[PDB]
Ligand binder design. Sequence first.
Ligand SMILES: [K+]
Ligand SMILES: [K+]
Ligand SMILES: [K+]
Ligand SMILES: [K+]
Ligand SMILES: [K+]
Ligand SMILES: [K+]
Ligand SMILES: [K+]
Ligand SMILES: [K+]
Ligand SMILES: [K+]
Ligand SMILES: [K+]
Ligand SMILES: [K+]
Ligand SMILES: [Mg+2]
Ligand SMILES: [Mg+2]
Ligand SMILES: [Mg+2]
Ligand SMILES: [Mg+2]
Ligand SMILES: [Mg+2]
Ligand SMILES: [Mg+2]
Ligand SMILES: [Mg+2]
Ligand SMILES: [Mg+2]
Ligand SMILES: [Mg+2]
Ligand SMILES: [Mg+2]
Ligand SMILES: [Mg+2]
Ligand SMILES: [Mg+2]
Ligand SMILES: [Mg+2]
Ligand SMILES: [Mg+2]
Ligand SMILES: [Mg+2]
Ligand SMILES: [Mg+2]
Ligand SMILES: [Mg+2]
Ligand SMILES: [Mg+2]
Ligand SMILES: [Mg+2]
Ligand SMILES: [Mg+2]
Ligand SMILES: [Mg+2]
Ligand SMILES: [Mg+2]
Ligand SMILES: [Mg+2]
Ligand SMILES: [Mg+2]
Ligand SMILES: [Mg+2]
Ligand SMILES: [Mg+2]
Ligand SMILES: [Mg+2]
Ligand SMILES: [Mg+2]
Ligand code: NA
Ligand code: NA
Ligand code: NA
Ligand code: NA
Ligand code: NA
Ligand code: NA
Ligand code: NA
Ligand code: NA
Ligand code: NA
Ligand code: NA
Ligand code: NA
Lengths: 128, 197, 229, 49, 68, 145, 96, 144
Amino acid sequence: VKPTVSKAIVKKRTKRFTRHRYELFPQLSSSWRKPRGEDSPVRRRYKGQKAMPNKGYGSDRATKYITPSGFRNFPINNVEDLYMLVMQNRKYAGVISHTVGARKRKAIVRKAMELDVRLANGNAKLRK
Amino acid sequence: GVDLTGISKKSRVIRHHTYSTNPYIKLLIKLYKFLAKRTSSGFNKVVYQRLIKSRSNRAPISLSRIAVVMKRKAVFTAKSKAAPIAVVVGDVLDDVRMARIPAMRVCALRFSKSARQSIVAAGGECLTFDQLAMIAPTGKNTYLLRGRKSGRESVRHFGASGVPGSHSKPYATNRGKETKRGRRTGRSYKRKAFRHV
Amino acid sequence: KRAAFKQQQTESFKKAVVARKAAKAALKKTAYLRARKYSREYRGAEKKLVTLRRQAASHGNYYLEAKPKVAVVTRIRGIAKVNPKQRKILQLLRLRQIFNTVFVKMNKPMENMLRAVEPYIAYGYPSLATVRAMVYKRGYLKINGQRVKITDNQMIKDKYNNVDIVCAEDMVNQIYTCGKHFRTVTHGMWPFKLAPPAGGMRQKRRHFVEGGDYGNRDTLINRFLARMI
Amino acid sequence: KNRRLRLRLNPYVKRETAAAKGMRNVANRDARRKAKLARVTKAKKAATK
Amino acid sequence: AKSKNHTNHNQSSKNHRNGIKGPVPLHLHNSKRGSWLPALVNARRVRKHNQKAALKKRRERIAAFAAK
Amino acid sequence: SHSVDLQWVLVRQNSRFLQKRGGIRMSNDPFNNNGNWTKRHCGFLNEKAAVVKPAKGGAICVTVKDGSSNNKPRQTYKKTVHAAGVRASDVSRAVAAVRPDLADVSFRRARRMACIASRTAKVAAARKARSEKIKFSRKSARAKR
Amino acid sequence: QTKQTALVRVENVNTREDATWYVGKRVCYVYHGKKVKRCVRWSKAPARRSTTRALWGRVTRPHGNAGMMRVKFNGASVPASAIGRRIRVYLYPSQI
Amino acid sequence: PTRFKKCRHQRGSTFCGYGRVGKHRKHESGRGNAGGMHHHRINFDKYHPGYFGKLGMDHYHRKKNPMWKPTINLNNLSRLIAAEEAAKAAKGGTLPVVDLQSSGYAKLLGNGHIQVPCIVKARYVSKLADKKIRKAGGAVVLQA
RNA sequence: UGAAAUGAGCGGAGUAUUUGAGCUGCGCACGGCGCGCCGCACGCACUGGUUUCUUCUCCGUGAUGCUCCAUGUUGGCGAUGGAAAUGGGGUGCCCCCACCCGUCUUGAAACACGGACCAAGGAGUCAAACAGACGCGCAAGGGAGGAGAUAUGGUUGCCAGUACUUCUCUCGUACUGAAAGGGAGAUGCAAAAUGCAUCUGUGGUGUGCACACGUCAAAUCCGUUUGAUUUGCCCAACACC
RNA sequence: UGCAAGGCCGGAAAGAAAAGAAUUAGAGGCACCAAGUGGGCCUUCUUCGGUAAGCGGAGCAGGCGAUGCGGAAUGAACCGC
RNA sequence: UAAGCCCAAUUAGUGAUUGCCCAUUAUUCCUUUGGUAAGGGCGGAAACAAAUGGAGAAAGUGUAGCCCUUCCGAUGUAGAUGUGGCCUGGAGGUUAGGACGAAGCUUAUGGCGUGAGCCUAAGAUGGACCGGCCUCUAGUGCAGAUCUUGGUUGGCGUA
Ligand SMILES: [K+]
Ligand SMILES: [K+]
Ligand SMILES: [K+]
Ligand SMILES: [K+]
Ligand SMILES: [K+]
Ligand SMILES: [K+]
Ligand SMILES: [K+]
Ligand SMILES: [K+]
Ligand SMILES: [K+]
Ligand SMILES: [K+]
Ligand SMILES: [K+]
Ligand SMILES: [Mg+2]
Ligand SMILES: [Mg+2]
Ligand SMILES: [Mg+2]
Ligand SMILES: [Mg+2]
Ligand SMILES: [Mg+2]
Ligand SMILES: [Mg+2]
Ligand SMILES: [Mg+2]
Ligand SMILES: [Mg+2]
Ligand SMILES: [Mg+2]
Ligand SMILES: [Mg+2]
Ligand SMILES: [Mg+2]
Ligand SMILES: [Mg+2]
Ligand SMILES: [Mg+2]
Ligand SMILES: [Mg+2]
Ligand SMILES: [Mg+2]
Ligand SMILES: [Mg+2]
Ligand SMILES: [Mg+2]
Ligand SMILES: [Mg+2]
Ligand SMILES: [Mg+2]
Ligand SMILES: [Mg+2]
Ligand SMILES: [Mg+2]
Ligand SMILES: [Mg+2]
Ligand SMILES: [Mg+2]
Ligand SMILES: [Mg+2]
Ligand SMILES: [Mg+2]
Ligand SMILES: [Mg+2]
Ligand SMILES: [Mg+2]
Ligand SMILES: [Mg+2]
Ligand code: NA
Ligand code: NA
Ligand code: NA
Ligand code: NA
Ligand code: NA
Ligand code: NA
Ligand code: NA
Ligand code: NA
Ligand code: NA
Ligand code: NA
Ligand code: NA
């Protein structure tokens, strides 16, 4: 199945918003923490520092949540989940959950091929 | 770079949804939101905005007050014309101090069991807001009524009780306590009962 | 087939489309005849003053020009370190941002308002070309509290609901000649938001007669604004 | 600076432009220059005497 | 450890943030308590008669409306 | 006594048919023509409803609830099967006979049902050809009764 | 600095009127890499295959009074290792 | 519920809405009603006038049972009359008899207009209540 | 890339009209000089006259599209491959930027204090009294509590729950006085140191939603709708009595 | 029949002319319940003590504190914003 | 023969009144977010099978926002508030997954979100439990307290 065509995806920013000084401490995770320090160079918005997330970085609502394939990801856990996406097969692609086993995945991949339902993580051999 | 000092002071606290969890209130708001925006009537707009209001701001009304204000309208009303429908966005409560009331059509969110009995026993009928929208889709010939709020004990305690001219009730659990100094001329001073404003 | 309620709408909308084309032609004809009369008034007024100056000069006399009635005021300073009195005048003049421009009447009450906030503004006496260029290129109306660009005379006719103001030439005439609807026309407009003067200023901190920018330039404001509009 | 918007706002702009074209005509400009100076000089002399 | 004694610096800025609200109109809070008593007692007798006349006028209006 | 307007307010946020997975609200509703969690498409909740369903072969079945037997859940929904080769506008007309606000989605679904039937036959035929060249160690068969 | 726009000084262009002649012309920076990678006509012209590479742009406007130009490169910005290196200003697109 | 409190919003704030200057210290004003006549006088004087001092007599061993005396008014007497009995009541005829002490009342007060005439048995009565109920066709009967 | 092209620009007609410059008619304004002659640069009215030159002007397509997406040309690359692209990830390097975090503080990059690393742990909680906002039930009444009853006098457990009851108790419906003690309707007639009569009724006044008869201004697709406003009643409130 | 006051009944209302003859990014009022503050500091002008001070103390107003950005090489407060 | 000081210009007695370079400013364009926001549509117009134009259209505070058009604002310490905002251990419901591999663990492992985070992939890891949604609940989120406990650690093959 081909996805519905949209406008170009812009992605205002690609780099992650990482925590300040997280590279100098193995303790600190890379995830974003708002600096509330009084003399924080990042909080005061100096020129050479790293940026802060805010509203202006939000992505265009037309192309938001759309994956590079052109679909939106909907997590499916068995064969019966594939039947919600029969009418919206050009908008949504199924994402088989990680914990779904190889025995159950065989029936999901077989069914989605006949229904013409895209799977984001099916076997690469099928669909050519 | 625009000089907009005090532009947040211009803005006001306007709520467009109800905090109420009642599903039937949400059906009345759904119905009267449609009527307010699709009809030219100013009745449907006032009713819709009062449905959003909180329980404290939708004060209850008594059956006696409805009877009194409808009689003031009953006089100076032509005999050919029918009496209006009393409409309250709130609760209608019974009054034991009025035994005899006229036959009135009253629409409300809630009627007490005795108020509903008293209205019906006098030849009237207790209406409902979707019943009103079907017989008065624009609110023609109605009486929009409000309950009283100034007699509430919270209102009578609001304000400092120790400033001149203030007759606020003190927040006290003991009535004998807090009665001496600042309350009697003999005991130091007395809070002045009058101030010019 | 079509539903009954859908058929009534089709007939009702067909008459609205016909009446919309009719009103478009009526206002186009009205705006043509009004603009023809306005342009003839401007030209004859120029010729009358030319002859008066010639008649006065040929007998040793002088001709006194009428004092200007309209001034065009632009804000040439930012929004930092403004005193409370100067701050309020610029708010009452609707000059709350740099390079914001308004038309004002040069009467005694307003002339004493402009003198107090001189270091922040640069005013002068506009010409017909200046008034036309601001209304046509930079003209916006306050419609339902929104800033809407003037794109046809139907918006002008609806915004003002006055027989004397139905077209963009009516707005130009009211501003240029200081008509009876000068305050109606100018208040119903958003303040003009201009670009910085191409080629630059001289010195925003000194008066024009001092070698700067912030005073009254008389009719020299028109070439200052031409680089901005 | 746009043709549609100028004509939409000013239906009479097609005639102000035609008047400006004739005023910038070299033959018209030179003829008017000769006539304007002669008729003002004549009226100046007549008033003087 | 001496400190600042007194200043009136940001005080006008604070007093004008929520404005200096204008006075109450003359038609509101025009109480006559504390005024000259002989004129206040005489005005009470007139106001009592005006209330009697106000009730009588509305009774006549009610009867007139029912008449027509 | 209890309307769809009231019932929708009760079930809009929690229902066994509502699937909010990763931010998307879908529906397992067997009587949903679309999969969207909206009042119009909640066919289990509306007084009258119609849904296009597949049948054996290329046939298309329209399951219709007309509100006559809503208190009898075994008689609430009736199935009428259209033979293979049926026009999708005829199926959309069968849905529009009870739900005129579902005629556009029922035409699109009756076409998908026919498209899926053809693709399933082609996918199955390509699977049979591939399996013919494979030797399998086991083959299960459910005993007859 | 704003790396999205580059400054190019061309030989014998020493006036602002000189640099206006080149507005819209194609500008190219030729360098080389380490490995032979894909080029235009990798298959049609195998003789073109080389470590040589080019980055293309266009002249947008002059810069100053002395014949400088502003150049915008296609998509990306020119590398800072190109500073002080040769730039090719072509005679097309032609206005003559 | 703990998940609804400000502590869950203030995770990461490091001060929890108490400031870097003033801080959340232990007992910065005293404990309880300390300093009501000094340091807290303005709060006590303007919000609780009358708090300090002595007033009146002392009633050792107050027993509240002897001084039990609930009141009901004339316009509220229909609360103690059954609906069918109130409908049948009329001036000059058979009237329902109301026992106040069995209903929890001792004194009849007599504010407003009486809605249904009745015979009221009360321990006490006002002069207005006694006068008004007689003019309306009822009566008060003293009881103990 | 024409998936509604509103164009002086697209399409149909036509070879003209008009708007400026010349030149001019009468009257009026205007300017010398004086109580009407001269001038008039060519202003205003006749939207005056002439056409010497200068311009193009006149019609036209609603959505029976509620919303989003989907339609060029020429090369290069890509013909199913350890491939061609595009994005992401990694490492180095150029040119520019760029003081150390937390913390008191008027002011910290500070020659101010705590800071070798990591893992696990670590700080607005529970109870009671009161208040205000919001949700819910009932309402001049609301509600227990303790305890009993029996489904259960049964069941390992579920069931320490749920279901049921209270002439009680409590908080209100009345407040004042230190206390003894008293204890609040309106109208009418009248002036009795507890006055009489009636009771379908805002104590009065000013301002005040909706509603009801109208009346104006504007827009109408001619059905109306949106603002104002006279009068009546004014609800909630506020202010004087 | 005059004055004072509370009303009632009417009238008139460029709804405020003309003389430079206002302007407004002008929804006014009214509550309720709460937090941080309650060490400040610096400037243009006025200003007191001191020989003066990067000194102590005030007035009107801006600013820093709480805020970066572009400029004065550098600089909490200067200049632009 | 300033690249210094005072004055004065803008390609120079030529024929008119913008030399040039730098902002988180101004104008304008695209996108996000929030309004004291302003409006339209929402009674499915009609027609239309596959093999060979599509899909959606919720009467709506807040979501992947019901959809479309329009206008304005957006920085901020202490502080307040909101969030169909993220995360953790348990409970009442509902719906799923797992020996064809559960939790946990690892990552040049990609995708999505402004973010807290979620999800997928691989394990040449593991070997038995556990995910989503609504509601309830609490010993519920760490970078630092000369913080507590355990381990490690440069100094250091040094004194
Ligand atoms: K405390
Ligand atoms: K091609
Ligand atoms: K550097
Ligand atoms: K501080
Ligand atoms: K000082
Ligand atoms: K928006
Ligand atoms: K459920
Ligand atoms: K699962
Ligand atoms: K840790
Ligand atoms: K650390
Ligand atoms: K340790
Ligand atoms: Mg903070
Ligand atoms: Mg710090
Ligand atoms: Mg700081
Ligand atoms: Mg795993
Ligand atoms: Mg009361
Ligand atoms: Mg300068
Ligand atoms: Mg300055
Ligand atoms: Mg101090
Ligand atoms: Mg149809
Ligand atoms: Mg706090
Ligand atoms: Mg403190
Ligand atoms: Mg004593
Ligand atoms: Mg044409
Ligand atoms: Mg310190
Ligand atoms: Mg210090
Ligand atoms: Mg620091
Ligand atoms: Mg130091
Ligand atoms: Mg210390
Ligand atoms: Mg009380
Ligand atoms: Mg302190
Ligand atoms: Mg600098
Ligand atoms: Mg901004
Ligand atoms: Mg902010
Ligand atoms: Mg989760
Ligand atoms: Mg736990
Ligand atoms: Mg790594
Ligand atoms: Mg803890
Ligand atoms: Mg330590
Ligand atoms: Na990202
Ligand atoms: Na790290
Ligand atoms: Na790199
Ligand atoms: Na009780
Ligand atoms: Na210094
Ligand atoms: Na600054
Ligand atoms: Na909603
Ligand atoms: Na915006
Ligand atoms: Na956690
Ligand atoms: Na921290
Ligand atoms: Na070592």
